[PDB]
Amino acid sequence: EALKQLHSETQRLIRESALNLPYHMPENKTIHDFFK
Amino acid sequence: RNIPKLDAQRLISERGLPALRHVFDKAKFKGKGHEAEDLKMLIRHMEHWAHRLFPKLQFEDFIDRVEYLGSKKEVQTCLKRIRLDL
Amino acid sequence: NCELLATCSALGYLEGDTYHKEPDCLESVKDLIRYLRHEDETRDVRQQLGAAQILQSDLLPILTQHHQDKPLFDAVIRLMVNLTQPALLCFGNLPKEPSFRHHFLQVLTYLQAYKEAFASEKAFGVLSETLYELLQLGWEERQEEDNLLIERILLLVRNILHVPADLDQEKKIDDDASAHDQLLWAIHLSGLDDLLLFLASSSAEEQWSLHVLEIVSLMFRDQNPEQLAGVGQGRLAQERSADFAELEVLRQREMAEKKTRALQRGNRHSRFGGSYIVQGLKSIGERDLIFHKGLHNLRNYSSDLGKQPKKVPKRRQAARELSIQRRSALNVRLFLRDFCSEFLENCYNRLMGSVKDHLLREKAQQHDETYYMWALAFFMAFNRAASFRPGLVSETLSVRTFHFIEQNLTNYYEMMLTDRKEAASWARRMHLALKAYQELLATVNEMDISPDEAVRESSRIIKNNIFYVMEYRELFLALFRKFDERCQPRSFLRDLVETTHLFLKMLERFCRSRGNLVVQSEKEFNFLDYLKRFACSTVVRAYVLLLRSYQQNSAHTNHCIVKMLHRLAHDLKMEALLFQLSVFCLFNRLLSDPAAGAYKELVTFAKYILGKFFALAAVNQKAFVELLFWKNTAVVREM
């Protein structure tokens, strides 16, 4: 029956782990480069 | 005057389900591969029964009303009775 | 009226193309603002100034040709914000009685006139230039003088974008420049769109995030994300050929229907007599039916040939979709595609983070989370359309957004059921929440398809979290068991069915791939016992309600409907739940359709269930009575 515990705790790890993503925000630039 | 209603007590268990038990005693279905014409025959017989019961409504309006009537005491008691014996 | 006429005259006059302002413009404008502030509840000054058209005749020329006169410019901007105040704010609600509704319609008419006038590029050019030279200064250099001016400028733009299209002139055909399209083109040519992108991307000017979100919402009010993302260089030939082909398809359908009607009636005039006795058919009495409507009609006889349909009473009248879709001008569509692309790449993450911060801090108006959920749906759909990159929306992919949307959807569901006097409005808010939830559930599938093992890992994490927590599973059943055609539109029903199909697709594939047994103090789970919760009469009733419009449904929607019903029938053996008389009438229409070959899946499923029914009927004749009502566990008694 210990496979039930193993599945439960592994799934707990797999939901408590952080969301690794290719997060990015591009270059900051002033309003001149936007408007003209 | 006696304006009629398609309600739970005037006709649904008087000229309705008791006759609907008998409507298909002489039906002429032919089974697999002929579902289209079997359904056409079924719809014609059901429509005819509904018309003779309450002639004021069209067939789909009658259906949408009788489905609501399916929740009423008399209707479900008659349904269980018809399921059991007579 | 006459005193207003005097002040309106005192504003000045136009000559050719140059406006000659009087020196007392400042005090006359202050007097106009005073009259507007001292309005009656009927908004008489609003109606009178709209009738006089001073916004079109004086204030726009003053704004466009005397913008160096800063006190007059500020006063004119405040006056124009006051005049362009939307009618729902002016009256608080839609009035329930004729007099206030007439006044509402008057104010709305003058607002539509203002929107027509505001399409000039010069006005938005002045607004963009003054906003640009204001925002050139640092945030710490601003005072109330400039911050309030930014508020009034953005509120003027918001007010002009918000205005409903005139019912008279909303009959524009597709590929034409509506008033909203011309307004968006004015924004594009003035360059205020780039200023909005700057305001959205700026960390320093984050204070205007809610305002900028509302501007972007009203800008993309009419559009569809996938349709917009499909726009490109070669679209003119595609749309021309598509228009010709669709014209021919419509014509062929009309010709076929005309031929069928011509066969249904005879080739003799209607006063050509003749009567028949149909000996087998008993009439409503015991006598045989006498038929008068011609021999041609007895091939497809029905007793409802001459019956008037019934008036659906007001309470039972089904909800109807609020607007038709029209393909806007191609230039505006290209501009909006470019706006959406650049906004998604440069602005979206910071703006959504800022709006979430505002909602957390509770310094937002009552329903601004609706704008948040709109932005989720639109921009994540646009991202998945064309080049999908999850980095562009990674601020939205957190489980916290799932939780927020689920909380909002349940809140709107409760408020729709309780606050019955605006249940349709709560249904629309819930529809926005549902579309946002749908787009998150679609995005995780796209992450699975995408090649990056990192996004596959986080997709697995969020899927584990969502399928573990109970509310995400129970919400679909909660929505189906209290959906109402009387209140919610068929577009909502379509979206609910498609979202349910996608959700069950993901859940079934997940459990098929690996066990992952514990769910919800945990308990065991399996997808079959989850599917058995969809065996209720109400959910299949809703599914066949959507199936009735199979002619107008999308092919994907029809696939969703038939796949769910095939899952309940073939895999759960619940055909007796779907043995119904109304459903059989719908099947009769499906089999009788001249275009039945186009619906091969639906007719095959219909013939499968019909064959099962007629087998049961041959075994037992009480099935005909069982067809007449919806059922609970008679689904097993019949078996």
Add this chain to the structure above:
DNA sequence: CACACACTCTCCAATTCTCTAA
């Protein structure tokens, strides 16, 4: 004149909303 049409108003009761028990 007077006998059919055309139109409005009122009342009556049948259906649906709300709250309760099976």
